[PDB]
Amino acid sequence: SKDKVTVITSPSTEELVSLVNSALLEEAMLTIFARCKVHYDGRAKSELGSGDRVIIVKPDGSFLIHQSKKREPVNWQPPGSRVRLELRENPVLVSIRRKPRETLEVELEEVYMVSVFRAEDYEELALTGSEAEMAELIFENPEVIEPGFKPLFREKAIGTGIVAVLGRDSDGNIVVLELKRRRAELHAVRQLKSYVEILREEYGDKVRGILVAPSLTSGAKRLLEKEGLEFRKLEPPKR
Amino acid sequence: SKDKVTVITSPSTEELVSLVNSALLEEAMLTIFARCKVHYDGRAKSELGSGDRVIIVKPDGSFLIHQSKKREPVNWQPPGSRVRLELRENPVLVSIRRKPRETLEVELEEVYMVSVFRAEDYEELALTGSEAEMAELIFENPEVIEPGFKPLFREKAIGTGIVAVLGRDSDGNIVVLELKRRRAELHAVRQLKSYVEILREEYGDKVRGILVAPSLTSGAKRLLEKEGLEFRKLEPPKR
DNA sequence: CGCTACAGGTCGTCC
DNA sequence: GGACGACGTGTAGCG
Ligand SMILES: [Mg+2]
Ligand SMILES: [Mg+2]
């Protein structure tokens, strides 16, 4: 239990069970290379036929099944799921989440490798360049929008929806910003339009919307213009 | 090397280099257990300090870095990225994505395990209970919407945006359907309202919007009612 | 929990 | 290759 790694290739069932169950009691990452079938029923339902895949069970219950292509797991289970290992015609990894009820079944036809990784990590990700940091830059230097802009509220719930920044201009109008940390799309403009309309019905037609993004799509421009909304070019800042 | 799996615990640098090399040449899966540092720069910028993680490099270029928590990799690179291994003071995995330019740098301070898995998988996931299945059901069976509903188009570009289902009703009105495979939120109603207004521009007051979904959030229902749009309860079929 | 919206979203289709 | 929207989206904030 004091080795970081414990690896077995071509494990016997006995060896499988021993390492699987120690991974769980030790709350260590479990990794397995195997030929398997996968059955999922839950929010949706899926079958994956027999094939080789990497399987990972994290100590927090996160379950991953990866094919040899793409970024997404072909199947998974979220944190807080519970897995048991089941002996049947083959060993079967069964993971269940409660609410909503989702079942993942991994039938292990052939286990090429099983491993316990007792991983120590006290460190957490520090990311910069987010939308939240655009909001900060704007409250710290409102001029990046325009002279006299005064930011007032961040994530202000209006009647229906939550607007990213609510504010006032030099004419004393209410100003909605919608921020995107990347090229803004039709859905961004729909957010803004939706918020502005809701405000307009309280505060009159003078309410301004501004989409604040590094750029926007052909579609966003068209709809923005058609709706009389505005665009300010802003890049997400990186610390 | 002719084996499906090769595993070396506590590799030397030469051992490390060798397996990494083979994984890439053999189009195999590369899995590393390591204490590392991660530096990422690209669409955003991030730093992860020294800690233990699982690393996976797929033969299609997908790069994954997993902490012992959550379902998401703490850092990654998408399919198509090119990876190399540089020997600085420590070995450094470098994976770069062209377009947009993104670089991922993993300093391997200690490699606990490195493995090559030559995975054979000819099988594609088969999933049921999607939104597209809802659409099929509605074309096969339009009365699930209402009697004498005539479905005409599916994923139809209108001028700005794309409608899930476009049709007519028995009274000669045009019908927009917005479909959701799960409980519908504000986002959905905004989509629906947006399309219906665009269609009203051409066909005038004779357009109906219908949100089709297993249920609604409070905000959705509120907004839906406000704009006088309609709801039909439908569960995605599991076939 | 339920609502709401962001994400380095990823992914697939189709103009 | 851009635009557009679904996704078993996952994840975080907030009430
Ligand atoms: Mg917003
Ligand atoms: Mg839609």
Chains A and B form CB pairs within 8 A to the count of: 202
**Three-state DSSP class for B159?**
coil
**Domain identity same for B110 and B151:** no
Task: Please name which of A118, A104, A115, A117 lies closest in space to residue A34, comparing C-alpha atoms.
Answer: A115
Strands B174-179 and B207-213: parallel
Residues of A in contact with B134 (CB under 8 A): none
Strands B162-168 and B150-157: antiparallel
* Residue B145 CB partners (closer than 8 Å, separation 6+): B138, B151, B175, B177, B210, B212, B232
- Residue B88 CA distance to nucleotide D7 C1' (Å): 40
Task: Please name which of B210, B107, B115 lies closest in space to residue B165, comparing C-alpha atoms.
Answer: B210
Residues of A in contact with B45 (CB under 8 A): 127-129, 238-239
In a domain, B182, yes or no: yes
The residue from B117, B146, B162 where one domain ends is: B117
Residue window 44-103, chain A: list those with CB within 8 Å of chain B: 44-54, 56, 58-60, 62, 64, 66-71, 73-79
The residue from B90, B117, B144 where one domain ends is: B117
- Which bases of strand D have any atom within 7 Å of the beta carbon of a protein residue? 1-12, 14
Decide if B193 touches A, using CB distance below 8 A. Answer: yes
Buried b (16+ CB within 10 A) or exposed e, B12-36: eeeebebbbeebbeeebbbbbbbbb
* Distance from C-alpha of B230 to C-alpha of B177, rounded to nearest angstrom: 9
In a domain, B159, yes or no: yes
**Domain identity same for A109 and A38:** yes
Contact B59, A69 (CB under 8 A): yes
Strands B45-57 and B29-41: antiparallel
Which pair of structure tokens corresponds to residue B25?
């040449």
**Domain identity same for A201 and A87:** no
Q: What domain range is B167 assigned to?
A: 131-233
The CATH number for B207's domain is 3.40.1350.10
**Domain identity same for A48 and A151:** no
Report the residue count for chain B: 239
The residue from B83, B117, B151 where one domain ends is: B117
- Residue B22 CA distance to nucleotide C3 C1' (Å): 49
**Domain identity same for B61 and B25:** yes
Q: Evaluate if the CB of A80 falls below 7 Å from strand D.
A: no
Q: Where are the alpha helices (DSSP H) in chain B?
A: 13-26, 131-140, 186-203, 218-226
Candidates A32, A63, A117, partner chain B, best to mutate (most B CBs within 10 A): A117
B218-226 helix and B186-203 helix, angle to the nearest 10 degrees: 20
Task: Please name which of B210, B125, B133 lies closest in space to residue B174, comparing C-alpha atoms.
Answer: B210
**Domain identity same for A145 and A105:** no
User: In terms of C-beta density within 10 A (0-12 exposed, 13-18 middle, 19 or more buried), how is residue A48 classed?
Assistant: buried
Decide if A180 touches B, using CB distance below 8 A. Answer: no
Contact A63, A104 (CB under 8 A): yes
| Resolution as reported, in Å | 2.6
**Three-state DSSP class for A227?**
coil
CA distances from A73 to A189, A209, B185 (A): 32, 39, 26
Q: Which residue has the tokens 């939104």?
A: B131
* Distance from C-alpha of A205 to C-alpha of A228, rounded to nearest angstrom: 11
Contact B82, B95 (CB under 8 A): yes
The CATH number for B62's domain is 2.70.180.20
Candidates B46, B58, B68, partner chain A, best to mutate (most A CBs within 10 A): B68
Q: Do the chains contact at A186 and B161, CB–CB below 8 Å? A: yes
* Distance from C-alpha of B118 to C-alpha of A67, rounded to nearest angstrom: 11
**Domain identity same for B50 and B145:** no
Q: How many domains does chain A have?
A: 2
The phi, psi pair for A137, rounded to 5°, reads -55, -35
**Domain identity same for B208 and B166:** yes
**Domain identity same for A113 and A173:** no
DSSP letter for each residue of A154-181: EEEE-SSSEEEEEEE-TT--EEEEEE-S
**Identity of the residue numbered A80:** G
**Domain identity same for B113 and B144:** no
Task: Please name which of A213, A142, A209 lies closest in space to residue A181, comparing C-alpha atoms.
Answer: A213
In a domain, B125, yes or no: no
The CA-based angle A41-A47-A50, given to 5 degrees, is: 135
Buried b (16+ CB within 10 A) or exposed e, A184-203: bebbbbbbbbbbbebbeeee
Q: Do the chains contact at A121 and B78, CB–CB below 8 Å? A: no
Q: Mark the breaks in chain B: residue after which each occurs, C to N over 2.5 Å.
A: none
**Three-state DSSP class for B41?**
strand
Ligand lying nearest the CA atom of residue B164: 2
Beta bridge partners of B111: B34
In a domain, B123, yes or no: no
* Residue B204 CB partners (closer than 8 Å, separation 6+): none
The CA-based angle A24-A63-B237, given to 5 degrees, is: 135
Which pair of structure tokens corresponds to residue A128?
């910069």
Q: Output B220-229 pairs: Cβ under 8 A, ≥24 positions apart.
A: B220/B184, B220/B185, B220/B186, B220/B188, B220/B189, B222/A160, B223/A160, B223/B186, B223/B189, B223/B190, B223/B193, B224/B189, B224/B192, B226/A160, B227/B189, B227/B193, B229/B189, B229/B192, B229/B193, B229/B196
The phi, psi pair for B18, rounded to 5°, reads -55, -50
* Distance from C-alpha of B57 to C-alpha of B79, rounded to nearest angstrom: 10
Which pair of structure tokens corresponds to residue B38?
């991660």
* Distance from C-alpha of A105 to C-alpha of A84, rounded to nearest angstrom: 10
Q: How many CB atoms lie within 10 A of CB A100?
A: 8
Whether cis (ω within 30° of 0) applies to the bond prior to B100 is yes
Method: X-ray
* Distance from C-alpha of A174 to C-alpha of B217, rounded to nearest angstrom: 28
| Distance from the first to the final alpha carbon of chain B | 43
**Domain identity same for A34 and A87:** yes
Ligand 2 geometric centre to CA of B233 (Å): 16
- Of all residues in chain A, the one with the smallest CA distance to B64 is A71
Q: Where are the alpha helices (DSSP H) in B119-239?
A: 131-140, 186-203, 218-226
Strands B102-117 and B63-66: unpaired
In a domain, B108, yes or no: yes
DSSP letter for each residue of B97-120: ETTTTEEEEEEEEEEEEEEEE---
Ligand lying nearest the CA atom of residue B176: 2
Q: Do the chains contact at B112 and A112, CB–CB below 8 Å? A: no
Three-class DSSP labels, A120-150 = CCCCCCEEECCHHHHHHHHHHCHHHCCCCCE
Report the residue count for chain A: 239
**Three-state DSSP class for B177?**
strand
Residues of A in contact with B32 (CB under 8 A): none
**Domain identity same for B113 and B200:** no
Name the CA radius of gyration of chain B, rounded. Answer: 26
